[PDB]
Swiss-Prot record:
One of its GO terms (cellular component) is host cell cytoplasm. Inhibits TNFRSF1A, TNFRSF6/FAS and TNFRSF12 induced apoptosis. Directs the degradation of host NFKBIB but not NFKBIA. Also suppresses host NF-kappa-B activation by interacting with and preventing ubiquitination of host NEMO/IKBKG, the NF-kappa-B essential modulator subunit of the IKK complex. Interferes with host CASP8/caspase-8 recruitment and activation at the death-inducing signaling complex (DISC). May lead to higher virus production and contribute to virus persistence and oncogenicity. Also participates in the inhibition of host autophagy by interacting with host SH3BP4. It is found in: Host cytoplasm; Host nucleus. Associates with the death-inducing signaling complex (DISC) formed by TNFRSF6/FAS, FADD and CASP8. Interacts with FADD. Interacts with host TRAF2. Interacts with host NEMO/IKBKG (via N-terminus). Interacts with host SH3BP4; this interaction plays an important in the suppression of host autophagy. It comes from Molluscum contagiosum virus subtype 1 (MOCV). This is Viral CASP8 and FADD-like apoptosis regulator.
């Protein structure tokens, strides 16, 4: 394999010192499928390294999703457009990236309403959610009881529609339709 496409871990751990706790949570969520059981970003990166999934493209996509254009420039010499050329070319899935982005378009009041909608749909979720739960944590909670998955996000779309955020609802409906079409007629990132 070409080592050029694999940044060294030390270079990465140093990069991590630039992210705060919220950003760490978002990255851990992005690595949920590939790095199971991990609780720290360091663990997730090590797991990805072991699988040779921690490529230049993967890191660039992570930084782009986190909107850290400062780090894309300083660490990879890439402008926003340069980074966009790499989107969809790593292990990262459109499902996970979309969920992170939608979460960043919600304010605390909207997030609170969504958590309440979820607990009303399934009261069992109350023990997995609190007033400090982030959107990505709400998504994982829904996934863990089978309400949503990478192939089905209509429950979340419905919740967003109830919130009157038809714009976010539409992004999820369109994603589900795109994923369905890809699976059915192509047998995504």
């Amino acid at each position: 394999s070409d080592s050029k496409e694999v940044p060294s871990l030390p270079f990465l751990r140093h990069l991590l010192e630039e992210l705060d706790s919220h950003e760490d949570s978002l990255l851990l969520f992005l690595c949920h499928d590939a790095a199971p059981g991990c609780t720290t970003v360091t663990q997730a990166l090590c797991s990805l390294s072991q699988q040779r999934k921690l490529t230049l493209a993967a890191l660039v996509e992570m930084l782009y999703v986190l909107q850290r254009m400062d780090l894309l420039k300083s660490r990879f010499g890439l402008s926003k457009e340069g980074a966009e050329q790499l989107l969809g070319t790593s292990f990262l899935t459109r499902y996970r990236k979309l969920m992170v982005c939608v979460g960043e378009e919600l304010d605390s009041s909207e997030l609170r309403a969504l958590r309440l909608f979820a607990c009303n749909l399934n009261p069992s979720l109350s023990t997995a959610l609190s007033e400090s739960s982030r959107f990505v944590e709400l998504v994982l909670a829904l996934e863990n009881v089978g309400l949503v998955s990478p192939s089905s996000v209509s429950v979340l779309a419905d919740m967003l529609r109830t919130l009157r955020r038809l714009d976010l609802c539409q992004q999820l409906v369109e994603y589900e339709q795109q994923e369905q079409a890809r699976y059915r007629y192509c047998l995504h990132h």
